[PDB]
From a paper:
Medusavirus medusae (MM), named for its ability to turn the Acanthamoeba castellanii (A. castellanii) host into stone through encystment, is one of the few NCLDV known to encode all four core histones (H2A, H2B, H3, and H4) on separate genes. We utilized cryogenic electron microscopy (cryo-EM) to reveal that the predicted viral core histones from MM form octamers that assemble with DNA into nucleosome-like particles (MM-NLPs). Just like its eukaryotic counterpart, MM-NLP207W contains two copies each of H2A, H2B, H3, and H4 as an octameric core formed by histone fold regions, wrapped by DNA in a left-handed superhelix.
Numbering used by the authors:
A (entry chain H), B (entry chain D): 67 to 167
C (entry chain E), D (entry chain A): 45 to 153
E (entry chain F), F (entry chain B): 12 to 92
G (entry chain C), H (entry chain G): 59 to 156
The structure:
Amino acid sequence: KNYDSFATFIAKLVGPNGKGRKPGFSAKGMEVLESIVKSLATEMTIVANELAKHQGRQTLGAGDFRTALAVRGSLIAREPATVKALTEMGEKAVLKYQSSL
Amino acid sequence: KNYDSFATFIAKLVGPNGKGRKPGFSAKGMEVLESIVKSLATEMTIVANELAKHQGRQTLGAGDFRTALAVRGSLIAREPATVKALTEMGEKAVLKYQSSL
Amino acid sequence: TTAKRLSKKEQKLSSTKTTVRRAPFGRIVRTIASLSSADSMRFSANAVDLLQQGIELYMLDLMKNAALAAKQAKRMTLMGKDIDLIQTANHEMIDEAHAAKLANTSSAG
Amino acid sequence: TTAKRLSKKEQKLSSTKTTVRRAPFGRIVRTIASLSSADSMRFSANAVDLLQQGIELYMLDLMKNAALAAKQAKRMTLMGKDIDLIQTANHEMIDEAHAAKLANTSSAG
Amino acid sequence: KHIKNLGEEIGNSAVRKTVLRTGVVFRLDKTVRPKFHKVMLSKLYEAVNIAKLAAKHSGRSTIQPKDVRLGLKLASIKLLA
Amino acid sequence: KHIKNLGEEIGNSAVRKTVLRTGVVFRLDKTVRPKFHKVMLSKLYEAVNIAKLAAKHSGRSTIQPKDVRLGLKLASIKLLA
Amino acid sequence: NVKRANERAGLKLPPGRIQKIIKANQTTDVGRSSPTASVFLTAVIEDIVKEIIKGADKKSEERGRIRISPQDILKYLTENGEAYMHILGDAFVSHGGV
Amino acid sequence: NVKRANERAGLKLPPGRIQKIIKANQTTDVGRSSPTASVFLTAVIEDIVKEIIKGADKKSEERGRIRISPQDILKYLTENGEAYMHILGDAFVSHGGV
DNA sequence: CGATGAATCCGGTGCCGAGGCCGCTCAATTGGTCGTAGACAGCTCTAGCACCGCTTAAACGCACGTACGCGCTGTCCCCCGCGTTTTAACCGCCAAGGGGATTACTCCCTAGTCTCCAGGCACGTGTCAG
DNA sequence: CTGACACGTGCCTGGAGACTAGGGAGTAATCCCCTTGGCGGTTAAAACGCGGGGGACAGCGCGTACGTGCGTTTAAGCGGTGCTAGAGCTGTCTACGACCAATTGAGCGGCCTCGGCACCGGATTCATCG
C-alpha cells in the first residue's frame, strides 16, 4: 500500500534555470513546504463550504472558492495585486481546462 | 408550516411558584436563551465530530460526546466539579430511554 | 468629583442608549457599504442594530484593556500610545494608510 | 556588554539548539501525562520533539511581547507584573491555585 | 453642515462616553481621538464588506440579519451567547 | 529535599536564555522566574492531557504524533505553516 | 406511542430538534449518527439552561420586577456564576451592564 | 488518456490530490463538489508555492550553501515578503530563530 | 454649629407586551425488514523502556561593584468645568416603487459502474555538502 | 571529514474513457411586504470660549539588587545490550442505523385581555463651608 503526498510534486516545480541556476532543495524544508499546501487548502475550503450553505445550494465550483479567496484577502487587508493576480491566474487556469470541454 | 425554535420549551422547564413567583420572560430574554443553546450544540458537536473522524469511525454513539465534553471542560481550566455532575446526569438520561426498549 | 458622578450615572442608567446615535451610525454604515463597489446596496431595519451592538461592545473591551494598561504604567490619564500596545499584543495590524482614507477622504452620507 | 555579546550568538544557537535539554523535557512531559489517571502513558519518540518546537516558540513570542510592553514604560529591566498584563490583554484565562500545586508539589524522577 | 467629512460623525463626546463607561481612567489627552477613529473605521470597513460580499454571492441586493451575523462571526467578534 | 521537585528542571538558565533570545531587554528582576514556570506548566498540562484523552478514546495506550498534532491545534496554538 | 420521548428520557426539550442541529455539522465521512447522541446532549443543555434561569430569576427580584432581561443575565448572574460562563467564554451578549 | 493533468491546465501539482482534501471537510449538506473547484484551488496553491520558493532560493544562497532550510524559509520571504505570509495567519515555522 | 444639592424612598398613572385561548395540519411514533459497520479473537514482528561506563559541556554558588529603580520637589502647560449658542435627532404622516418570495419546467452536468495501462512509490548507489 | 540526496530501476493499481440515468440549478411570472424619502415642530445634545489647577516630564540623591568572573560539581549524552507491551493486519458472526408505509395528536399562528414598567411629583440623610 502506498502513501499519497506532494513530496515529489513540490520538487517538480520550476527548477530549470539558465540565468540563475539553483534548482536546489533539501529534506528539512520538505515538511514545511508540504504542510503549507494542506493548511491553505483546508483554510479556504472551510470558508467556501460555509459560504455555500447561505445560498441553500450544495455544489462547490469556481464560485464559493473564488469568494472565499476574496474574503481571505479582505480580512488580511493585503495589497490589491496579491489577490488580483491570484484570481486572474485561477480564471486563466479554469479557462484552459474548460477549453477542451 | 413548522419552525425550529425552543420558546415553548424554554418557557417550561423551571417549575413555577417555587415560593409564589412564576418565571417571567422578556422579549430579549428569549433571544439570548436560544443563542446559548445554539452555540453550545454547535461547538460541542464540532469538537465531537473532529475526534470521531480522527479515530476513523462513522457513528457518534454518545461515547464520542463524553470525551468532547471532557475536552471542553479541561480546555477552559474548569475543574471537574461541575463536569462530573453533568456527565452523570447525561449518562442517567441515556439509560432511561434505552432501557424502555 | 463631577466625572465620578457622570461615570456612575452612565454605567447604570444608560444600559440601552448607545454612545453614538442611530442616524449617524446608519449614515456611516451606508457610506462604507458603497465603498469598493458599484451599486447602492440598500439595507434592512434590524441589521444596523446588530452591527451597533457588535461594534460598540467590541470597542468597549479594547478601551478597558488599554485603560488598565495605562493605570498599570503608574499614570492617571490615558494616552493614544496605550491603545497601540494592546493592538500589537492582540495582533491584527491595521494598514495605517486605509484608516486614513477612511477617516479623511471618505466624506458623504 | 557581555549580555549583548551573548545575545548576539543566542539567535544563531536558536537556529539549531533548544532552551531546556531533552531529558528534562522527556521527564516533565511523562510526569504530567501520568497525572489525571493511574496508567503509564508510554510516549513515543517524536511526540516530545513535536511538543518542544511548539511550546518553546509560543513562550518566546510571549516574552517578546512582555519585554516590548516593559520597554514602553521607560523601564529597562523586566518584571513579572508585565507578564500578567500581557496575559490578561490576550484574554488568556488562567488558574493560579492549580498552577501553584503543579509547580510546587511533584517528584518527576 | 459646513463640515461633513467622515469620522467626526462619530462625535468627539462619543470617545469620552466610551472611555468613561469603564471606571478605571477619568482623563484623556488630545491624541486619543484619532486612534479611536482609525481603529473603529478599520474594523467596521471589513465587518461590513464581508456581509456585503456574502449577500451579493447569493443573489439579492439588500443586506439581512443573517448576512451581518455571518460577517460578525467571520470577523473574529463573537456575538450574544 | 531534592526529590527533583517539579518546575526547577526548567532552571534559571532556560528563563534567562528565553528572555535574552530577543534583543530588546537584557535585564530581568526576581519576580520573572517564579512566573515563567507557572505560565508554562498550565499550558503544557492543557496541551498534553487533551492528546492523552484523544489517544485513550481510540483504544491504544501510547501517544502518537497525530494525537499531539491535534492537541496543539485544539490548544489555540498553531504549528508550522 | 412513545411520542413523549421527552417523558421517555425524562427530558423537556425535544431530542429531534437538537438532532436537527447536530446533523448540520458532520463534515461527511461520518454520517450515521446513532440516536443516542441527542439524548445525552439534550440532558446536559437542559441542566445548564435550567440552572441559568433559576439563578437569574432568584437574583432579578432583588432589583424588583418579574422579568428576565439581558441586563439581568450578562451582569448580576454570569459575573457571579462564572462556572457556566467560562464554557462559552465569549459573552459579548447584549444590552447589559458589567 | 487525459491523465496528463499537468498539461490540462498548464499546472504541475495533480488536481486529484487536492480534491480529496477538499472532500475531506464538507458538512453533510453539500456533497456534489463539481470537479472545476479543484483546478482553481490547485492553480492558486501552485502559484503561491512557486513564488515563495523562487523568492527564498536566491537569498538562501547568499548566507552560503545551496539548499533550502526551515530558517531559510522563515527568514526573508516570510519576513520580507509578508504578502504571502499574512494570508496563512501565524508563522511558527520551525527551529528557524527569529 | 447650622445645612447647599441631593441619598434615596412613597404615591399613584395609563399605554401598549406577555400570557391564556382555539382550533387545525403536518411532524413525531410505529411496525417491517436488511445489508453494511462495528465489534473482537488471534497473531506476528516493531519499536519503547531500562541499565552500564566515560567523557566533557553546562548549570551552579559565592564575592564584589556598579547600573538603575524609586521617592522629592519646582514647574508649567494642557485637560476639565460651566454657561451658551448652534445644530440636528426624532417622531407623526404619506407616498412610491425596488426587490424578497413562490411556482413551472426543462435540460445540463454530477454520480456510478466496467475496463486498462503507464505514472508514481519503494529499493541500490555514489559523490559532494553540513 | 561522512552520510544524504539526486540519479537510476522495477513494478502495480489508481486515474481514465465512457456510457448512462436522474435530479438540481437556471429562469420567466406574479404580487404584495418593506426600504427610502420629503415635511416640520418642538427640544435635547454636541460644539465652543474662558479660567484656574493638578499631572506629566525632568533633574538630583540614595541604596540595594543584578551582572560578572571563577572554582566546583553534575547529570546530559554517546553507543551498546537485552526484554517485552502493544501497534497492526486478518477472518467471522451479528446488532442496530436506514429507508418505507400508515396514523394522530401537539405546537405553530391569531385573537383578546389586563397588568408591568417608564414616568413624574413630593419628602427627606449626608453634608458642609462658612
